[PDB]
């Protein structure tokens, strides 16, 4: 039931009080660029009692992949295992992991391969304050309240949870459709694409409009009937990535070779199975799509105007 | 609540058709249903059916073979019919309001009856 | 669909606490809290007592309480008095969109 | 239904659960200037089936014309063909195509004729969170929930849709009544009006 | 009529102007009178029963000025008319001035 | 952001029962403190010594029981965490770039 304010009707207890509820999510926008897969962190079940006891809680780091859900205002956690109920959160994350980028770990790593440049924007406010149903995990200590009588003899559920809300999406706050210049990176890797690779991670919840979509079983009906129409949902994403690459050359001295071997031994072998071929990425091939006349393209013109 | 009224064929003969009418007073139909309940002697209460403003009707599965209903918003009254009256059809009929509403898309509230009428005696 | 099944005759001394306890099915009483009670004085309009198993309208004696357990509802009377001298009929809303009624029960002050 | 919170409703009709509803639209402003008509993008019925199956989707490019409606917060799509219901969206777009300018293409064409200037300004937020009525074309997988009993035996409709809201229109956020100087075009056509023509496309929902 | 006053050949009617507006719809209501223009039958699917007759489609909002704040005030500040937009550079022909003021922030 | 997490008493259940699940709340905080320290030296003249004695008598004594052994602080020990090369750490790189 709703605890924000007393309501005309309250849940009658029982065996199943689940309701059909929907909410708009926390707003997010982030773009990470690097030559190694990004790293994320989430709360998952820890090292392993009676049935129904609280799971141990642990912080896990894992490579972010295409299709992994972003945090949505319910926290970055592994719902599949931490919620055996299977109905604590909306339908699109109740059996998934909400990963949040590990900015601290990615920034602090010695070589800075995973993060040349990054942007982020987030915002949310509580929309509604609700209550949870089910047996109480830990009873409220008896020293925090005074026992009631009659209706108040039994405490109501104290497991509160808010429903997030993203507020306004506006064009002035956009992060994309602008050129980012990587002239100087934070880490030691100043934009070098070791191994001939890049990794562009993007989250954009400001274009998340789903399209209601309906079809008619039969056109003979002159009057509207609910049974005669099927409903659907769809979502469309559009992307277009432009890059400017500057060629560089490396002198293979003894010291340089030893340093490059210590940093990553794969480079030297390359210059004469794939470790990352266990993850799902949106493979983008640019081998046949390099052109040296920059002014012929919009990002090229912008780059020329500013060098 | 509201005020209900009763008048109909109090006296009948076997194989006749019974006709009832009730007039709401002090209120309007609104989005509530309206039903009929009878108390034959040596019995309890038997539910008949219900009807709201829009014409939607629900009927008792056993008695729906002889029961029909209609409503009229002009005079604030809803009527009933039940053909082939027998001895067992004798009962003190009543008119009641059904304030039942839906709450949260899954479960109903205020499923009781109320605004009970004093009752009318029909004998076959 | 089916009439609800009840203890047709009940009695107690003045000031006793007696419960009309009344039985149904899963489809009407078990999975739903749509239980209600009626009080029938001789030849009078039935008087609603309790609705939604444990809700009391205005104008009814606070001595009346409602409860439910499994398939069996109850209507508890605290401090048996004169005004309790009346029939009691239960009701329920089944999942099949129909209303049901009990056999009736009658109270008696010894 | 109103899925934001547990509301109170009349006894269900069963058939034709349709209500008289209104909403203010998402706010927008734009001004494209070029020597060729602009290009717009909208989802339509795509390449090719039991009746009632989900139509295929396709991104279509078409020239924007005077009187073509703009995206309203329900998505840029061809409602006429993608919604046979004719009651999914408000009255002024239930039989029209909502088109959105194709900035990517209009900036990536070689000569940059179609577009050498453009401003845009749009904002919205969800006011209410409603639910659709109609047979479900794609049942929820059984892996995502635990079967109920009694009242919750049959799942409620899971086709949610928000009603947009443009929020506040203010004078300081105005694009018009203000001169723009076309002294440095983005593309290669630096303001030359080939054929003695122009095409000024303007949208303004803050004077509606 | 800003367009007309600014487009005046001589620029007498407007040396200097400021303006600030803001509004958002608070509520969404319906009108009652009989429908002047019936909704075309091809914009919807005919209903039945309760939905046999269409509800009034003459919607109207109720505005709201939102927040009045001191940082957005225009008045109690000196405006220097160094250069007018038009051709009249502040000259008060005929020894007259016209100062039109609207202020709904003190109502 | 308190995260609701629950555990089921019995997994051999086909229909949802409120009594079959236990609900819990938990909250996790994550911190990372980085510092840049600069070495300084003090001349122990008579005036400096008397001034420091007036300021806090314990400075000179320590320069040869814990008074704050009454409070609960999140103790952090950095005795083994000092490293001169700033450019190896992100805050050090920012500090170097800021000079």
Numbering used by the authors:
A (entry chain D): 141 to 188, 194 to 417, 452 to 486
B (entry chain H): 1 to 82, 82A, 82B, 82C, 83 to 100, 100A, 100B, 100C, ...
C (entry chain L): 1 to 9, 11 to 27, 27A, 27B, 27C, 28 to 95, 95A, 96 to 106, ...
D (entry chain E): 141 to 188, 194 to 353
E (entry chain A): 247 to 353
F (entry chain C): 354 to 417, 452 to 486
The article reads:
The Fab bound to the top, interior of the capsomer at the interface between the DE-loops of P1 and P2 and the FG-loop of P1, with a total BSA of ~941 Å2. On P1 the DE- and FG-loop are buried by ~295 and ~234 Å2, respectively, and the DE-loop of P2 is buried by ~412 Å2. B25M05 binds with a total BSA of ~839 Å2, with ~679 Å2 from the HC and ~150 Å2 from the LC. Instead of five Fabs per capsomer, B25M05 bound one Fab per capsomer at the pentameric apex. This structure has been observed with other papillomavirus binding antibodies suggesting that this is also an immunodominant public epitope.
The C-terminus of each L1 connects capsomers by an extension, referred to as an arm, that bridges the intercapsomer canyon, forming disulfide bonds with the neighboring capsomer and returning to the parent capsomer. Although the C-terminal arm has been shown to be immunogenic, most antibodies target sequences encoded by five surface exposed loops (BC, DE, EF, FG and HI) and because the amino acid sequences that form these loops vary by type, antibody responses tend to be type-specific or weakly cross-reactive.
